[PDB]
Ligand binder design. Structure first.
Ligand SMILES: O=C(O)C1=C[C@H](O)[C@H](O)[C@H](O[C@H]2[C@H](O)[C@H](O)[C@H](O[C@H]3[C@H](O)[C@H](O)[C@H](O)O[C@@H]3C(=O)O)O[C@@H]2C(=O)O)O1
Ligand SMILES: O=C(O)C1=C[C@H](O)[C@H](O)[C@H](O[C@H]2[C@H](O)[C@H](O)[C@H](O[C@H]3[C@H](O)[C@H](O)[C@H](O)O[C@@H]3C(=O)O)O[C@@H]2C(=O)O)O1
Lengths: 380, 380
């Protein structure tokens, strides 16, 4: 049985079982994934300290990014304070190296850790561990366990927790570290350091004002906060807290954010409303991968008002079939393929075979290098 | 009379004459522009050599960018060859510093040169000259006079001239250097070096295979090629060639690109078809700013085939009133404010009061720091 973590454990256990039996289709698929993963064996580990412009703490180990929809105001001599254009990414975001480097690290650690679980090859644990040590626990290169300066905004006077949603890029890699435990390359000292980092990160996100505020956000930020929260708690093996989070935070959030007709009105007021409805359900999808490993199905368990997450999928399904029929603001085209994994996840959790069939009809490319698609041979 | 250059010379002369007469409205506007321009006096001059990853020539003085719509192919192990997603800008473009640095230099040099022309204050010529020297003529920091590696694409086997369109961000700055001739800071030796650079760049764009190809492009690339061409030719005082380019290349190109209803079919097949319809006419607008300084009006002069550029403005005008009425693919919102200067330019050249009225109704923000709007107090 697969360790508790941020992945479809059923699909991952099935892939490993078939790989070890020498099942030909799976063996070839994993051999393709190994050719994809070679670049991560070669990759120099990234660090949040690889920036020149320091955060207000003067600590290069503090994560800092620009909130993506905030732009300099041309009518101000210094451009300050920045103003918001919902749905229009300011290219200035690429001036903060950790926005993309956290994504590159997360991909590399996720791919390598999953390949170690499937194949048992030490080379993948050794390379996974190298990325994990440098990003997380190194006393010089490792990130401080906080998101204080995530999605900062020039000129903004108030503190926000909005940037915490950036954590999902590296909290998935934190969770996969559970998969390399027991390797030779991941020592007891490595585990204790990362256990301590994860405990300090969990403390920060539960007790800092920014973490508290993000825990109560009325939209997909609150849903993603608990997805991240569950990844951290599952890394730390706190299964009682996972039950408590789902019952006391995730379910009440669903019950409030799903309307009677199954729409998500907080996402409907965005300029990318079909993307943000989908993104809210992707948060529930990642939360569910974890809750369902301990017996809780987030797709069909009702809130106290009887609302269920499947209602939100039902509402969106015809627009996954035909995005052009979407009737709310969507100022960039919607990528239909983001529905494939989502409809598969929800479909199998609900026994809804129309959803699974559509997940496969949409599908994913067999040879794609997108690391989140590794477990989904079933869609390829 | 203002020196020949890439600006509305009528508006620039009017601003200078009013400023010298102490007219209050103009004097206040220019004092705002002087506050805006302060950042450029302090800003450290940029150079194309400020890059890490070198181009295939191994020369940091070669300009190099990535063609913006080309992306790694995730179904290939190394992502190669890149594939095209029209209208979707790959954020990898920001890994090539001269993409945005050419923009920043172009803004800095344009603003300072225009302010030296209006105010006569030497401090603007001194700073303008500092930017010009470093970007263009410096024997270590100045760019080589070519665009061989502009908008290169990883894995593409053929040479393209498509990246030449990048030149417009610095060819306007080249044009404005004429405005600081006669200042104390811009010496005869300075002018001589920039004359030689511009002569070599003109040779490259006219005789290189890439320049030849871009000069033959049947869409807005061909229009921008000649607008840049006219800027280089005007800087070099080749008024006889300006006339020849207008009559033998620009007007025939414009006439071949306009369909019977005034639409631009080459731009209509783009995913950003309202933007590229406008971008094609913006090339003609900047070309006309120069030709009309020697008596050639590109908006009203018919081509050989009876087509005239006013017909294309006429087709687009209702969609400038209501961009939501646009019936062709436009996968990002169209910025209506780009119609302001365009309709003013075309309206004034055509004596079309309806166009000028809408230009002022749409308007530009009085306090904006966008350097391209400096001559347009009339719209603010
Ligand atoms: O929705 C997301 O997951 C998301 C991801 C991006 O990285 C940003 O974090 C972005 O955050 C949004 C946030 O979700 C809200 O829509 C918020 O809206 C508020 C505005 O910022 C203004 O303050 C407005 O007056 O009120 C809004 C509100 O509270 O509804 O904006 C942020 C943002 O763009 O920073 O979305
Ligand atoms: O239109 C522009 O000014 C423009 C600016 C961008 O920076 C790019 O240079 C982009 O160039 C376009 C170009 O205008 C054409 O649309 C071209 O189309 C060709 C495609 O690249 C393929 O080769 C296709 O098979 O044929 C197309 C054709 O010839 O119409 O694409 C480039 C580009 O995106 O590289 O536009």
């Amino acid at each position: 049985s697969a360790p508790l973590g941020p992945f479809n454990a059923t699909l991952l256990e099935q892939l490993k079982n078939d790989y070890q039996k020498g099942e030909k289709e799976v063996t070839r698929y994993i051999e393709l994934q190994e050719k994809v993963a070679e670049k991560y064996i070669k990759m120099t580990p990234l660090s949040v300290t690889a920036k020149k412009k320091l955060p207000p703490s003067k600590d290069p180990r503090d994560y800092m990014t620009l909130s993506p929809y905030w732009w300099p105001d041309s009518t101000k001599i210094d451009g300050l304070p920045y103003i918001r254009k919902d749905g229009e990414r300011n290219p200035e975001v690429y001036e903060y190296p950790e926005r993309e480097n956290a994504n590159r690290f997360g991909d590399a650690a996720y791919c390598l850790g999953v390949l170690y679980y499937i194949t048992g090859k030490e080379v993948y644990a050794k390379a996974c561990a190298n990325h994990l040590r440098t990003w997380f626990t190194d006393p010089k290169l490792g990130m401080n366990p906080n998101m204080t300066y995530a999605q900062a905004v020039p000129g903004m006077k108030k503190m926000r927790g909005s940037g915490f949603i950036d954590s999902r890029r590296f909290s998935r890699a934190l969770g996969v570290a559970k998969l390399i435990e027991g390797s030779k390359s991941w020592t007891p000292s490595d585990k204790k350091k990362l256990d301590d980092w994860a405990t300090a990160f969990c403390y920060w996100m539960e007790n800092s004002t920014q973490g508290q505020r993000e825990s109560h956000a009325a939209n997909n930020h609150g849903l993603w906060y608990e997805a991240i929260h569950l990844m951290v708690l599952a890394y730390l093996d706190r299964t009682d807290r996972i039950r408590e989070v789902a019952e006391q935070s995730i379910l009440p959030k669903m019950g409030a954010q799903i309307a009677d007709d199954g729409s998500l009105p907080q996402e409907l007021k965005r300029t990318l409303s079909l993307h943000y409805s989908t993104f809210a359900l992707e948060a529930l999808m990642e939360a569910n991968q974890i809750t369902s490993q301990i017996g809780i199905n987030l797709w069909s368990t009702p809130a106290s008002n009887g609302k269920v997450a499947s209602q939100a999928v039902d509402y969106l399904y015809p627009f996954y079939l035909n995005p052009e029929d979407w009737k709310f603001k969507q100022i960039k085209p919607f990528d239909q393929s983001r529905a494939a994994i989502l409809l598969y996840e929800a479909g199998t959790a609900l026994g809804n075979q129309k959803y699974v069939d559509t997940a496969k009809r949409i599908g994913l490319k067999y040879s794609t290098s997108d690391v989140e698609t590794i477990p989904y041979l079933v869609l390829k």
